[PDB]
Design a binder for this molecule. Structure first.
Ligand code: NI
Ligand code: NI
Ligand code: NI
Ligand code: NI
Ligand code: NI
Ligand code: NI
Lengths: 238, 569, 238, 342, 569
């Protein structure tokens, strides 16, 4: 019966679920491991039966255990239980979000933040810019992307955003639906202000002179808002 | 010259010319196109059979004597579907034909001579194919290997450094040091390996160093920033080192749209992963790229085939990932601008059309490294059930279509990454990575995996029993999986540059080490049975897919073959 | 409890059988894996009980599942289920041949041969020979064995079968019960007709001259039917 | 001294490691199985789950010998390989030895003919290496009388001399009485249980491709699985007629029960024939040594490795297995390989 | 896709499928069986032709790039007669097919890719065949080499030490010292070489030592005493060292008759020189041997073809030799018991029947080392003119018969002496010993001889002229004939034993040195298109030849082709 190593993985999980249930049967507050295995073993069988759809099990899994069935802490712990099973249409990923509820105090590793607000990008005075997505597709820019070089679709005053980035929490971004128009905040880039990569519009020291070159480049490359060519005076290298 | 019936003959030597086999529980029927044997002289091993001293086995072999003969095997390969003996010598497929003892049998090339030094492997009734080659692997966990292996895959190409976020997001092994770790780690496994480096850099020096360090190519990925700069720079260095480049398109369209990405590629060769879009890439018209000449279209495992559950499933993965919320609109937008059920269904059909060429996995990151083969055949089954046989099909079979899909995970990935000369198809001169399939379980569960000319993994029973058949019968490591044997049987691929710089001796690598080549002169036209080019558009509003004017789409399915029938889970 | 690795193998198989049954319980068409494990887990216990003999379980295993309990295809698949278990007399190999039946269409990998007959050994005109086994033990000859050198017991016209083999499907053989007498077909050996090995009666190029030597040799070696020594003229090497 | 480690043995019984000389290198999983059973040395042939190997204990040609020797580095068990003696080609015959083989193996499926037999033996004499053999069941080349004439009185290790494991039908078992023969029995038909006859017929049928409706097929089955010669075995061992106990792993043999079965048989024979004449005192010591030797010192000698292993004696490699008297012969306490706990 | 006439097309690319060529001034008509090119994409070199930068010649070649392409050549080989490009790389024939630039042309395997490193050789209108292989050479004078060479022969196998009587009588290089002299002398020439040792010895030790010393085989000859002892001993040692044995039968029948000689051979393999009898051998029924299975029949140059002058000529050679007188009866008897006009004429026909297999020369000793090829074709011409076309012939051509004779001096001698793997036919993987023939002069005077992948000899004109065509136009040594180049281009054959003992480094041999193999498992059935066996008798009284009951004989001829038409002498 050529059992794959994946199959053995599941066969083991199942008896971890079986144990899990048999314990609840005897009436015993399940724990992190037991709760998860149980939820997992369950979904597994249901997919075997070929009845419940993937979409349905996502939920039905949230009714396998009630707050009084588990130990305090378990709820705050099992944020979610992902699991794969073979449906008549093949294996599919079922994610049972928050299966049980926090009917108790104890919360492992809980955080005790201190109400107050972190002030991001200290002293980097932002600037607002009118931006509109003239294209027919979406466009989302990251927090540290040289704004001046985003999709050539976003129309706006390129000239004004040279050497700047979206003044937002590191790692996040701003979305622009086709047609949408908004005003974004953008501070200047820190460090050595050495802009290399992106759209290849700068690739050097970001200064007022490099700027001239950047606009000229964007201009010829079709980046909406890229000012204009009021007669360029090409340097010895660019 | 007495004669015998076909029913009988086939239970002794297996199907012969004109006969047909059903592939697994699918509707795909294959027909034996030719037979090199000589009715009456076929090879058989056993108690009183033909392979014995002075008889089939020569007492005066040729000085090319085989180390192993797979008798009466049905070879399914893009080169054809036929009957013939396979000869194996020095880890390489030494011959495909009659073979036996010239001393007692007519027509037997000396590259197929059977002597006291050759071992016997019965293949009658079985189908032999080359090992599979998954080229979109995330080296997230080493446990993937024995999984992909058990599934008929002998070669994994990808990137990473283990369960690190960078790896979980991208198939990249960054920098020469991390390349070292992985190459040295690879010594341990039973699976040819190749690694991709971080192409997400506009620094030429850093770009070539990773190749000089051992990488078979670059990988540009979104999470690392797939910009037209990075794209452009990477490609140039890729051209110099004759190595391949894979890419994950800029979904957020922050740098530009698919139009720009192409301009970036400047017409140079490219391996596009999950070209469809679900696995990632330009929203929502990335799938259009798979129609250009210079592109090597590849689809990612998950959205294949298109089942009534695939749409629901994905939305979940995409949400469980990326940190998306149901109450946030920008979050629901991205989800809908990426998981287009339209471009998904349009995929299954694109494969059938030869538009798409390679089938990957995308292991541990929106991909199932153990179901690439299984799913490649499921899809083929669907498309037949919905579109019927093929126009190109000749005769009352599915041979052509069969080769179409096989090529998708054998010869096509092999070429896309310059390792076609050594592996990727059942042909003389190539490394002997062969997997024996028992017709019923075809495409799902294989009989045994032979790595580098020696058995590395096979179904095995109670190690205490009086035979290998009794239960339990799972996949047990064979001899080519242990000791120093693994080293002779496996290959870690590298670039010419590194190979030439002595990267092997450099890292104390005891594995056979070959370099990749001919990666810069290949196009969509080099993809076997998947060379169809075309100007394909994609509706910005309805996310509908149009090709050459018309529009393509497939209907989801409620049931697929090669599934619940064969596995307990 | 010094558990052997073999024991763990079985303990795993058992819970594969247990799952198999528990699923059938819930009323679900078992599959290849499930059917096999089930049949296996069963036989295993029965041997443990020390009641049913090996011979009995071979059959009883054929009644563990009915055609409507499994999925279509499973029957045509499980040709047989071999399994070892420890009886009071030690472990024994139980092979449950064709446990379930083909109550359906679907047949994985089924063959679609093309009614017609393959003609073996094209153009090799056979010849019949009277053969009798004068010995008190059985004697079975293979399809490609130089007939002229079989057991010295089989009496017949050796002279007539020099450089020939049983004109039959490759790999098969012809049996001769002590006393039995039959006429066999035998074509000439192909290839370079280089006969080496067997009984050492030839070990060279098979021609009319080597023949002389072969008969002379068999003669002295006692091979019934080996003509006679009408005064041999030994060559410079033999 | 301060450099010596201590291992408590009081209450325990120490014996040498077992040596199975009829192994089919079908699957590497056999090793840890045979090991757990008190066996530290496996001698046989093969290249993995390949039909040739499943049928015979042979690792053919120097290349395949290479693969296996290099593979062996991985395991915890002394190893030795046998080459294909089924060849009348002297050159091919010695090359496999020069390549690493400890001996040859002539097997039916490869064609155990008087030619092959004769040639193999000669080269075996030159290279002072051993030869194992599986007799010509079908008697196609000749009968057991001929096979012997072939052997010409030279040394030979006869596997499953009884017959069930294969060999001349039906009088092969007679060979085990000749001077030049090294009789060995195969695991399966040992001991003789009410189920052994039924079991075998099945293995022989599941194998060979035999049918119930075909008479020639039922004949072969009955001309090979003689319940008579089977039962005659248990007693032959007790008589000292048979000498070695093998397994024949993954091919009509259980590589994990050689020791267990060797003792079961000894137990039976005592229960049916009683104590022994040679026995001295109120014990079974003599008989005990009789069986022990069957899977230790006798297989060791039969394959020229008696000097290093095969018995608890000074100067030899320290392959010792500690047995807890209750579990003796079934489940051992610990296996020490080469002087260290493995 | 405009189209063009056949007359035109053929003056640009040469004959295509179905077209026929007359071979020289003979009646043998060959027909192009297949064409690998792709009408419209064929390769042409010239002023404004196709082989140029970016076009046929790639700017992105494959990493297999050829060193030389012979365009549109008509390949005549035992494997077939067809149209195709020949690719040459590293002294070996790297590919036979389309070839060109994949960048601009469909269907072009990478083993046929044309890049800036490949040279161009026009072959349209010309016929390409493998080099000839004369295996019955007497190393009497080194001047023979450039003669045999000019005639299309690239490989000479034989024996000797120069103009010494032993050599003039036999093709033997006796003892390891004399083997040394010759191997070291061979470095100087442009022709692959192999030497035979003195098999006329019943001393096993002396027998093997000559092989260990470098000999590719033994030669038993009358003048040295071809006895059943010598014969028997030689053969045994020959079996051990997998090397070949040639033989010259005991004419005087002193030890025994042809019946005995055979019993001596004990069925083992043997290369029989001048099996007919004129060149020497058992009187008068030696020719019968050429019908046995274990025999490798070869005919000697002189009595071929059978002309009205051949009988008179021979009697003279046999008399000028041996010291025979007209007044002495025993002397006239021997002459008549050896120069049977009956067995001579029976020869021409035996060749036509496939009974005979190899055509030698027997240089400087009843053989003309410069006319082996010429005469092989003359004979074929006669037999057609007298017996007509062949039964096996398929279509309105002589293709089959053509291959019959070609094989006689290419693939058949190559196999008979274990060097078939490297040379002996126009096939991929073999050493590139090719000779270009201009259809009119076919079989007589060739255009150019390429040794080991490089041009070694060609027709050349006034070295001062403004072109290579103006007279005088004789055969001039080319570059592969000089400096250290000769060493890379030539091969001296040896036994495995010597090769393994380092015979190369041993003797400071700068030539490529290969060993012969597979000489003991070949029979008359290994001779391409000349595998006919048969029980042939020979009348003791009339010296008449009978085969399978009937009798064979040919009629002499008054005129032959490929003769006076082409040479001024
Ligand atoms: Ni991706
Ligand atoms: Ni990925
Ligand atoms: Ni056996
Ligand atoms: Ni065995
Ligand atoms: Ni001569
Ligand atoms: Ni001569």
């Amino acid at each position: 019966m050529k059992l794959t190593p994946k199959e053995l993985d599941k066969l083991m999980l199942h008896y971890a679920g079986e144990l899990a249930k048999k314990r609840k049967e005897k009436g015993i507050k399940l724990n992190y491991v037991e709760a998860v295995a149980l939820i997992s073993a369950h979904i597994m069988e249901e997919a075997r039966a070929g009845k419940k759809t993937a979409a349905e099990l996502m939920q039905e899994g949230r009714t396998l255990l009630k707050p009084d069935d588990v130990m305090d802490g378990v709820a705050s712990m099992i944020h979610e239980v992902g699991i794969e099973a073979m449906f008549p249409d093949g294996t599919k990923l079922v994610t049972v979000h928050t299966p049980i509820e926090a009917n108790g105090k104890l919360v492992p590793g809980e955080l005790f933040l201190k109400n107050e607000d972190i002030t991001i990008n200290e002293g980097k005075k932002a600037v607002s810019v009118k931006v509109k997505n003239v294209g027919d597709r979406p466009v989302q820019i990251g927090s540290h992307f040289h704004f001046f070089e985003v999709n050539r679709c976003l129309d706006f005053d390129r000239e004004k955003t040279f050497g700047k980035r979206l003044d937002i929490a590191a790692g996040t971004a701003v979305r622009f639906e086709p047609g949408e128009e908004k005003s974004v905040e953008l501070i200047d880039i820190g460090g050595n202000r050495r802009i290399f990569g992106f759209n290849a519009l700068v690739d050097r020291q970001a200064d007022n002179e490099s700027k001239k070159i950047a606009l000229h480049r964007a201009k010829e490359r079709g980046f909406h808002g890229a000012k204009s060519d009021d007669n360029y005076v090409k340097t010895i290298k660019e | 010259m007495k004669k015998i019936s076909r029913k009988e003959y086939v239970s002794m030597y297996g199907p012969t010319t004109g006969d047909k086999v059903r592939l697994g529980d699918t509707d795909l029927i294959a027909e034996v196109e030719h037979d090199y044997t000589i009715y009456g002289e076929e090879l058989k091993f056993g108690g009183g059979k033909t392979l014995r001293e002075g008889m089939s086995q020569s007492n005066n072999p040729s000085k090319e004597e085989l180390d192993l003969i797979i008798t009466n095997a049905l070879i399914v390969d893009y080169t054809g579907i036929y009957k013939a003996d396979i000869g194996i010598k020095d880890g390489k497929i030494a011959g495909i034909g009659k073979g036996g003892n010239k001393d007692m049998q007519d027509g037997v090339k000396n590259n197929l001579s059977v002597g006291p030094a050759t071992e016997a492997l019965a293949g009658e009734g079985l189908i032999v194919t080359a090992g599979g080659i998954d080229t979109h692997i995330h080296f997230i966990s080493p446990q993937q290997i024995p999984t992909a292996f058990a599934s008929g895959v002998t070669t994994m190409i990808g990137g990473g450094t283990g369960p690190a976020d960078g790896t979980n997001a991208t198939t990249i092994t960054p920098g020469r040091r991390n390349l070292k770790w992985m190459l040295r780690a690879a010594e341990e496994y039973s699976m040819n390996l190749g690694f991709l480096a971080k192409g997400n850099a506009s620094n030429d020096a850093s770009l070539a160093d990773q190749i000089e360090a051992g990488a078979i190519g670059f990988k540009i990925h979104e999470d690392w920033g797939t910009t037209p700069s990075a794209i452009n720079h990477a490609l140039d260095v890729a051209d110099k080192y004759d190595v391949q480049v894979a890419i994950h398109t800029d979904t957020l369209n922050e740098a530009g749209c698919v139009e720009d990405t192409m301009a970036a590629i400047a017409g140079r060769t490219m391996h596009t992963f999950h070209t469809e879009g679900a696995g990632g890439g330009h929203a929502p018209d990335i799938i259009k790229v798979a129609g250009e000449h210079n592109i090597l279209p590849a689809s990612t495992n998950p959205t294949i085939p298109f089942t009534v559950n695939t749409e629901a499933e994905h939305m979940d993965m995409l949400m469980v990932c990326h940190h998306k919320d149901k109450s946030i609109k920008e979050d629901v937008q991205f989800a809908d601008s990426r998981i287009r059920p339209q471009t998904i269904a349009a995929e299954d059909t694109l494969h059938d059309m030869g538009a798409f060429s390679i089938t990957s996995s995308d292991s541990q990151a929106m991909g199932r490294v153990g179901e690439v083969i299984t799913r490649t055949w499921q899809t083929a089954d669907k498309n037949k059930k919905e579109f019927g046989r093929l126009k190109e099909e000749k005769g009352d079979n599915d041979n052509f279509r069969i080769k179409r899909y096989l090529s998708k995970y054998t010869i096509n990935p092999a070429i896309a990454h310059g390792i076609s000369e050594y592996v990727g198809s059942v042909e003389v001169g190539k490394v002997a990575d062969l997997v024996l399939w028992s017709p019923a379980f075809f495409g799902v569960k294989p009989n045994m995996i032979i790595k580098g000319g020696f058995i590395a993994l096979s179904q095995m029973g109670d190690a205490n029993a009086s035979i290998p058949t009794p239960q339990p019968v799972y996949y047990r490591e064979m001899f080519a999986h242990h000791g120093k044997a693994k080293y002779d049987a496996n290959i870690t691929f590298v670039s010419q540059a590194a190979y030439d710089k002595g990267i092997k001796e450099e890292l104390g690598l005891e594995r056979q080490v070959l370099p990749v080549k001919n990666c810069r002169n290949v196009t969509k036209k080099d993809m076997q049975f998947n060379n169809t080019t075309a100007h394909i558009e994609v509706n910005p509003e309805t996310y509908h897919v149009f090709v050459d004017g018309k529009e393509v789409t497939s209907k989801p399915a409620n049931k697929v073959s090669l599934a619940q029938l064969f596995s307990i889970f």
